[PDB]
Amino acid sequence: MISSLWIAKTGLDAQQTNMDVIANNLANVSTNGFKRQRAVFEDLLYQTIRQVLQIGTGVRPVATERLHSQGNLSQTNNSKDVAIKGQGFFQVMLPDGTSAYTRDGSFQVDQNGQLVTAGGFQVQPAITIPANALSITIGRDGVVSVTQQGQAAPVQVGQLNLTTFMNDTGLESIGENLYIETQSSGAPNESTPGLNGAGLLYQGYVETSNVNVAEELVNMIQVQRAYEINSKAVSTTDQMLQKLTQL
Amino acid sequence: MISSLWIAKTGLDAQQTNMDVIANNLANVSTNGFKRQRAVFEDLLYQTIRQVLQIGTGVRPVATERLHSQGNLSQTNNSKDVAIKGQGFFQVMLPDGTSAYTRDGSFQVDQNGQLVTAGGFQVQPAITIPANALSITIGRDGVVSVTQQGQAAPVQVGQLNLTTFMNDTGLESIGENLYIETQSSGAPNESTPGLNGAGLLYQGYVETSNVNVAEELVNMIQVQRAYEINSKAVSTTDQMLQKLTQL
Amino acid sequence: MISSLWIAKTGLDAQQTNMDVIANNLANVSTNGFKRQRAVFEDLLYQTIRQ
Amino acid sequence: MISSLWIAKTGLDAQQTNMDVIANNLANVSTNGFKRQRAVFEDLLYQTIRQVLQIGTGVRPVATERLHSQGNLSQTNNSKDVAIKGQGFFQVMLPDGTSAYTRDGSFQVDQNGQLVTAGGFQVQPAITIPANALSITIGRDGVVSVTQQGQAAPVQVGQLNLTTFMNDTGLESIGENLYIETQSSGAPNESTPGLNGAGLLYQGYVETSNVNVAEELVNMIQVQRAYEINSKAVSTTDQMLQKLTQL
């Protein structure tokens, strides 16, 4: 009755949410530095009547759980492309003054010669970009050691450190592969790149998504199948309902 | 339901836009002084319900992002062909009075003896072209030091400077490999060629497109494959839809 | 999946860059006092999960 | 049901990981001093119910297992190229102060006249490189017996020993054909080259990868075929699934 009603309901929304999770987890290929999520089906409190006579409740997905793994990467060969071998996150300023974190390989200049990224999102710490800076020879740990015209020297026009945290599951994607520090994110530490969990700067390259598709295509197929099996359970429930409202 | 609907929609248009981007990025070989674009897939705001129970949205391509790299170049050996070693952009007048910028190696004369390009688009600054000017010995920095008939001297009949900017991503192709100054383009500076980021004049030659094809052919293949995988996701979604409208 | 995608990508661009390097290294005969270049294929960081 | 689901899953990821392993094992030709890896498919615990009524689980790849064999080598004839006949590993300093190990044949000088390699990675022990050192006559066991201008003698400007270990499978490639001592790597011993497993210095030459391709091309073909056969197993499983959700 109401038992099969709510049980079919929670199986329906569990399989629906699983379908939406893997559906959003297949379309996010070529998202830069991306870590993919997945739901975990878990029960609820059971209800024992007598020592063992229980009831049993719950098939619930708890939450979508991230997978912080370095995905595929591409050899792009541009000075405005920097990947990070291993871990360590970037630190860039949002234009409202707040910070941001990412794994990005696409940075630009504004009209006023500052270093920004993603079409005008300034870095942390900020770097002014000249026009006579011919070559851009970036050090592995933030040393923006460019060479200007008439200046035959790798002039360090900027120094950058990498921010590390304690639980990157608490970090949340806040729009176009950006992250900010949350409660469960951990404590920030812009340590020197190459130490304390931070990687180094690979100039010329980008990071991308850790999206394994064919495994999650099998997951799509089996979640569709379990959605249809929940539909079969609803069909049997409503067949009993119509045969008993005939009764 | 609507979740899988919009998710399949944005994966569909992301892969479609990627296919169109690489499709337009393969046909533009032999375009002179050309810098090729590419889209970047990026998420949107996620939606946390509880400290970590999120929702997650976005696979969006942000924009097509240019790659300002010197492509292939050809040895053409004509005085109306001038390439630029390195950087520095040309400055030519549009016939409505406005300026234009390019990396061109094909310039002409009008009926009235002025220096134009691309079939009647005047240079900046303008140069009058005589008829007794036998040889055209162009200096490396705009010195149009031609030698006229009866005048055994490299008569400088024109001086040209090269315009530099601050963010060439803001420059937009405004028709037949032309560019004009935009907001994000940077500040113009027609400095002497050979300094402040400007190159020199290579008389006899042209610049061309930075189009790497086989890498982007692999990109075409994988975007076709991901388009088909999004089609498989739509197929599973609609199979659940038809089996549940059977229910 | 993405693994074979990027692996085929970096093998493709490595062999392409090698082809361009030897291609530019064969046309530069009779260049005066010239010293020729060559690329060196090298790995990246490996990723150990367990000893 | 779930049995065929997880069995198809582990066969799918086993064949996928095998495909990625041989795919990364075919692109690493001309990597210097390289030893190639390979996965090993192995079962899990079986589950006997009665003395023999078992269940049986596992097709798992355990890990990628290196093959420490000397590959192909090339006659390069440069004093900055040194191969090692047989075994024995180099010892070079990483710029953070830590050591490194390799089989390299490409070493350089810095701006400040020290001996480095790979574009500025100093050797262990460090050697200062003069400018009047005309010829570089390297001894077979680290004797950098160069001859300086005005000094008609093989002046030993450096001595080098070779580091040996106990299990080179524990050594891990830490970026651009470098290695460092790990737990399973063994104990280091920079013995004299030519003894205790160490080879000698072949000035003029390099070592390279032990990549046999056509055998591993047959491996690529058969892993593709077994991937398709796992796909056939998934197809039969889902055909039973759809014919039984018809039931």
Residue numbers in the entry:
A (entry chain A), B (entry chain F), D (entry chain G): 1 to 51, 65 to 260
C (entry chain a): 1 to 51
From the paper:
We constructed a structural model of the flagellar distal rod by fitting the crystal structure of FlgG20 into the previous cryoEM map of a polyrod and a new hook model using the previous cryoEM map of the hook. We, therefore, conducted rigid body fitting of the FlgG20 structure into the cryoEM map (EMDataBank ID: EMD-6683) using UCSF Chimera, and compared it with the previous model. We found here that the elongated density can be assigned as the l-stretch, as is seen in Cj-FlgE, considering the structural similarity between FlgG20 and Cj-FlgE and the amino acid sequence similarity between St-FlgG and Cj-FlgE. Then, we constructed a new subunit model of the distal rod by connecting the FlgG20 model with the D0-l-stretch model built on the basis of the Cj-FlgE structure. The new model revealed that the l-stretch extensively contacts with the D1 domains of other FlgG subunits and thereby reinforces the rod structure. The l-stretch extends along the D1 domain of FlgG in the −5 position toward that in the −10 position. The l-stretch also interacts with the D1 domains of FlgG in the −11 and −16 positions and thereby mediates the 6-start interactions of the subunits in the −5 and −11 positions and those in the −10 and −16 positions. Interacting with the −5 and −10 subunits, the long l-stretch of FlgG fastens three adjacent protofilaments in the rod. In addition, the l-stretch mediates the 6-start interaction of −5 and −11 subunits and 0 and −11 subunits. These 5-start and 6-start interaction networks make the distal rod rigid in its straight form. Moreover, the tight interaction of l-stretch with the D1 domain in the −5 position may stabilize the upright orientation of FlgG, forming tight subunit packing in the distal rod.
The axial structure consists of three morphologically distinct regions, the rod, the hook, and the filament from the proximal to the distal end, with a few minor components. The function of the hook is a universal joint that transmits motor torque to the filament in any orientation relative to the motor axis. The rod is a drive shaft that penetrates the peptidoglycan (PG) layer and the outer membrane and connects the hook with the rotor of the motor. The distal rod and hook show distinct mechanical properties, although they share the same helical symmetry and repeat distance and are composed of similar subunit proteins (FlgG and FlgE) with 39% sequence identity.
